[PDB]
Design a protein around this ligand. Structure first.
Ligand SMILES: OC[C@H]1O[C@H](O[C@H]2[C@H](O)[C@@H](O)[C@@H](O)O[C@@H]2CO)[C@H](O)[C@@H](O)[C@@H]1O
Ligand SMILES: OC[C@H]1O[C@H](O[C@H]2[C@H](O)[C@@H](O)[C@@H](O)O[C@@H]2CO)[C@H](O)[C@@H](O)[C@@H]1O
Ligand code: NAG
Ligand code: NAG
Ligand code: NAG
Ligand code: ZN
Ligand code: ZN
Lengths: 693, 663
């Protein structure tokens, strides 16, 4: 007997959200194992701002069955009843460390499964520095030293407060005072001396050009991984990218500040179950039986490291690695995050205060003051990066930052969205509003198509144009495969009455569908072949001839006529079933002097999936790659004896799962493939010479 | 015998240059037979760097009458007009394979005679191992195993790029892109990922002491023939030395790299005629009558193997040997060398990249970059950005010249994942492009859904230096697609849906689903076990078949109706679709899709329809309609239908309750 019996005839499913920076593939593999055993499928998807999006959808009774995050968010969900209560047997609970269970406990109830323990650690290049700086104060020396070598000392994400927090709290800065076994929200440690010291040091570092304020995760990763930075600050999940990198690296404790250790907020990677989920039992089985296991966490950790796991058995072995040991050493120096809801607001309040102090929009005192005032305020979560959250006597509100520093380049930063029938270009609203823009922010080649405040995203100001030639001065450009719709975005120096000239040429390229070209034609010349697949499958292959190199504007009527130098553009299309499963392959294409496809005289354009020769007389654009295929032939230059010829194409449906369809053509011919299945042949003709202007 | 008439009182001589690794003796023997018949002397010499030496002497109106080499060089000579045009009869051309003639063709003219087809093959001791390693990745293991015996696994010449090329080209590597029937010289495939993979693997091989970077032809041949190496990689011309050796050997296909086959550059051994020679006629007779023949090639091939010959007659018999067959198999995997002149410059650029990466003088990136380069201010500030949204992929492209105009000395761009890096993109314009799948989570791509649409977005970082300066730019790009009904239904956590299992042919299992949707796009399905509607609200219903390929069938909804009770058999029915057609001609009912596809879709204003009752249940009878007769999609002329309707309850899907807003 098998496990599969209990879940048989399941209409149930399992949907998982996790941040893409952790290993999704290992989790997916565990999903494949779960699918193997139980016969139930498991999906893993990464939405933008998933921790923020989850509550929104979850409120409506929709979302993933499982959500992965650091515990600090979870209690915020629990307060809203978005998380189903976990109630595992003691035997199971005993397998994980109690503090990891404490992290996920909220208001007495377990709202999630602890997975792993996350703490920021100091990552450095072993080749570049043998001994890393043990303190923060000695880094500027290193940077000044390394600046001569054409490199930098330290680069790490400055955009997320998670990364800058440890230095701030190093001297005793804190989020929410823990008192009488409970967190006090009206007691906030943001504006004290230690925070100011840490942040002042950070600002003083970036002011000295030791680090750029524009630096983010991606940039720092890229910089460090190319060995152009001596060290960075990060968690286990990064390591996977460094291993593959030629960089020889090491992980140790963060540097001290004022003789005090860096105090990182320690996260617990945790898996919550949606309260709306019908699948809760399956989720519990999956998480308990499969996800948390030596093998499972081995897999996930193998894709990307988890750091210190909550599972005792695997951890006891996993600690043997020095890096996670360093991660623990760091964690023990810092403090585990509160799971309370306010943490959502806190993080937002710091981020605003760090970037303002870094950009120089405010002093550390002013920034931290605003921060402390906004620490528990939930409204401030609604504010974008470029917005200040301002506190009135009555209530908090969002406001655009009053001052931006804009290079002639900064204006070129933009969002380009290519939709199916339309194109949209978007630019930051505040950066524009800063310059005195009330309205009519921007326009395209046609000045009548103007900017509007984006109805979806308050942050953006957007311009839209259909993707077709002639509205809003949009322009179409075709090549054999694709149709590219392009336009230019002008910025208006008028309303602001100040001149800095920039324009952005943007374009959306879409694949060309010849079936549309055929449907557009009143009476196109086309041959069709129905192909039955198995009991229930049915497919259709069509072959048609086109007047243009774009493979558009097909010939109409019962005959085609060519100039001596003319190119015939042939194309083939597949319909029915999954166009993904099968790829359209043209196995043998040839011409005959007669109408019979069985003609003893065959002139092969394509033979054995490959061109008959390398001459320009035959050009094959698309074969075996997709649902369509395309090739051109100069017909009467290729076969010249005859005043007309007929065209024949043998076609085969290529399963892309079990065989690779795209042919490899060496330019050496066997001529052993002369066997043709006439049931698979499409025929078109006659193809005649003009003989008249 | 009677040939003697056309040659009497003979004069002049014939001088031939050919590489010494091929049979010099056989060619000379044929030359001596030619001398016997014609009474004209023929000299055969093998100079050092003969291919480089030929143009030098040829420029002065001095040199050999005939030159033997791979075709890739010849177009370089032809461009210099050092080669006389050959004009053999069709009857003769039919005797050799056309592609061999295509190789020797340049700018429309045939500049030389094809002799043989050469491709690198994997030579191994058949006695030593029954089956050779099928991949490159497993070689270090074999070597480590063989390291205990005081020997090595694989040794071959690393000095000539010709021998190392296949691994480089195994994964997506290429010299010159073949487009519109001609080779593109400004389109170069040297700096791509696969080449880097292969060459990096090679460096990693020599770094592990599995093979010495100093290894050359002599060393590998001498070593393998003496049994100090288990296997090597080489062409036919080497075999002659292995045959005499007591070693029992075999020849097979090169090992795969990254799941893809090795693509050796396939050479065509070819004989060109000097343009300065008055003796061209004699050269032509020599090449046509004697050199290319069963008897002629027999001598040369018997002396040393030519591999697969261009001559049909001799090849047809010669294929029966497994070695040349393996050589053919290898040839079929790779691609023939372009005949263009630039190849002369190419080989020089790669050779530098092979030795520099091996010795450790440069990184693979630097070497391949330099090679690729060798192969081929600001007033207003503007940028060129092109986004291509494919079905399975996205490509983002930025124009080079604009980046230069914007003051970028060098271009580094990448996505959220720094592992995804830009490459040089050749189109109607020269671009720098990055590619990513259109699904979320590779390359740090992220999904954003709204009720109607699934939007896949990512950020493109663009900067001059890896260490970031004051100038760095980032560009957010996104591809938004409409949501599929099935997908919308499958994505939903707890959608309201009714399902019916169907068997077809008694084989396999399929199902039919009916579900309710909040949007006119038929997306954003209702959640829960019940739906509640305003009096004026529109219920968007859809029905789809799932669980495998039903493509031969179109989903047809014959009768769809509402009942005040939960019973589908209720005598009181309000018909939305009756006799396959919409009950009313009004905006109150719209049937979007019926009998057309695997899906069906319709909207109804439910409570103007149901009237007096504050709740209803929805019922849809469904059938698989065979589309072969093309009668499936129903035609509705008028709103008048028979009240009597025959319904099979086994095919009816039921959903409810559907309740009115405000009690
Ligand atoms: O910086 C604010 C952010 O910090 C934490 O998120 C971390 C997370 O702990 C790590 O697992 C890793 O993924 O990096 C994240 C930040 O980039 C908090 O969990 C989160 O609520 C908070 O917004
Ligand atoms: O390595 C560069 C070199 O490769 C080719 O020459 C080959 C030749 O094609 C083979 O037949 C073999 O036997 O000898 C050479 C080994 O490299 C190119 O034809 C030549 O121009 C180039 O220098
Ligand atoms: C110029 O912009 C940068 C980055 O924002 C920063 O130095 C600051 O915002 C501006 N300069 C000053 C002196 O404030
Ligand atoms: C056609 O142009 C598009 C961009 O406009 C490009 O992505 C595609 O590769 C081009 N087709 C070919 C065959 O090069
Ligand atoms: C959903 O988002 C897409 C992505 O741009 C947009 O095109 C569409 O208009 C949006 N639909 C609604 C109903 O907001
Ligand atoms: Zn089970
Ligand atoms: Zn003669």
């Amino acid at each position: 007997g098998h496990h599969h019996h209990h879940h048989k005839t399941e209409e149930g499913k399992l949907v998982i959200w996790i941040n893409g920076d952790k290993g999704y593939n290992g989790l997916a593999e565990v999903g494949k194992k779960f699918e193997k055993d139980t016969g139930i499928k498991v999906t893993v998807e990464h939405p933008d701002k998933l921790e923020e999006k989850f509550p929104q959808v979850a409120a409506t009774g929709d979302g993933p069955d499982i959500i992965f995050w650091a515990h600090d968010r979870f209690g915020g969900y629990a307060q809203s009843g978005l998380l189903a209560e976990i109630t595992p047997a003691a035997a199971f609970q005993d397998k994980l460390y109690p503090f990891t269970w404490d992290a996920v406990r909220y208001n007495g109830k377990l709202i999630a499964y602890p997975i792993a323990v996350e703490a920021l650690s100091l990552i450095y290049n072993k080749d570049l520095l043998p001994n890393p700086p043990k303190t923060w104060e000695e880094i500027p020396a290193l940077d000044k030293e390394l600046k001569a070598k054409g490199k930098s000392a330290l680069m790490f994400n400055l955009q997320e407060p998670y990364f800058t927090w440890p230095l701030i709290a190093a001297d005793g800065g804190y989020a929410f005072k823990y008192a009488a076994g409970k967190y006090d929200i009206k007691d906030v440690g943001v504006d004290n001396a230690g925070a100011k010291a840490g942040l002042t040091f950070l600002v003083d570092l970036i002011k000295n050009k030791h680090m750029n304020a524009d630096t983010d995760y991606s940039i720092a990763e890229h910089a460090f991984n190319h060995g152009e930075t001596a060290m960075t600050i990060n968690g286990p999940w990064a390591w996977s990218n460094i291993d593959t990198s030629a960089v020889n690296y090491g992980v140790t404790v963060l540097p001290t500040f004022k003789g005090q250790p860096s105090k990182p907020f320690v996260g617990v990677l945790s898996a919550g179950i949606n309260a709306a989920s019908p699948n809760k039992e399956l989720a519990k089985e999956f998480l308990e039986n499969y996800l948390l296991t030596d093998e499972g966490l081995e897999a996930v950790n193998k894709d990307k490291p988890l750091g210190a796991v909550a599972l005792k058995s695997y951890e006891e072995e996993l600690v043997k690695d020095p890096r996670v040991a360093a991660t623990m050493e760091n964690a023990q120096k810092g403090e585990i995050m509160p799971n309370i809801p306010q943490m959502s607001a806190f993080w937002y309040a710091v981020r605003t205060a760090v970037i303002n102090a870094a950009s120089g929009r405010q002093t550390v005192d002013a920034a931290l003051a605003a921060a402390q005032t906004n620490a528990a305020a939930g409204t401030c979560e609604e504010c974008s990066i470029d917005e200040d959250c301002k506190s009135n006597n009555g209530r908090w509100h969002c406001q655009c930052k009053q001052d931006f520093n804009i290079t002639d380049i900064s204006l070129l930063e933009h969002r380009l969205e290519c939709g199916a029938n339309d194109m949209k270009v978007s630019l930051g609203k505040c950066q524009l509003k800063s310059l005195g823009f009330d309205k009519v922010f921007m326009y395209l080649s046609d000045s009548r198509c103007s900017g509007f405040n984006d109805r979806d995203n308050r942050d953006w100001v957007s311009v839209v144009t259909p993707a077709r030639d002639g509205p809003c001065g949009t322009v179409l450009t075709r090549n054999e495969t694709h149709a590219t719709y392009s336009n230019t975005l002008y910025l208006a120096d008028e309303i602001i009455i100040r001149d800095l000239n920039i324009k952005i040429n943007f374009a959306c390229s879409y694949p060309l569908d010849m079936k549309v070209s055929l449907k557009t034609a009143l009476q196109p010349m086309v041959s069709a072949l129905n192909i039955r697949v198995g009991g229930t499958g049915m497919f259709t292959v069509r072959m048609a001839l086109f007047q243009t190199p774009s493979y558009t504007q097909p010939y109409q009527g019962s005959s085609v006529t060519l100039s001596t130098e003319a190119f015939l553009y042939v194309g083939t299309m597949l319909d029915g079933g999954d166009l993904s499963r099968f790829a359209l392959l043209m196995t043998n294409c040839y011409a005959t002097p007669s109408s019979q496809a069985t003609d003893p005289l065959k002139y092969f354009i394509i033979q054995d999936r490959c061109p008959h020769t390398r001459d320009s007389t035959i050009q094959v654009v698309e074969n075996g790659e997709s649902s369509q295929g395309r090739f051109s032939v100069q017909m009467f230059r290729f076969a010249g004896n005859y005043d007309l010829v007929y065209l024949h194409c043998e076609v085969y449906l290529c399963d892309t799962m079990n065989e690779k369809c795209k042919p490899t053509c060496s330019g050496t011919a066997f001529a052993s493939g002369s066997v043709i299945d006439q049931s698979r042949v499409l025929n078109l003709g006659p193809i005649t010479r003009k003989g008249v202007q």
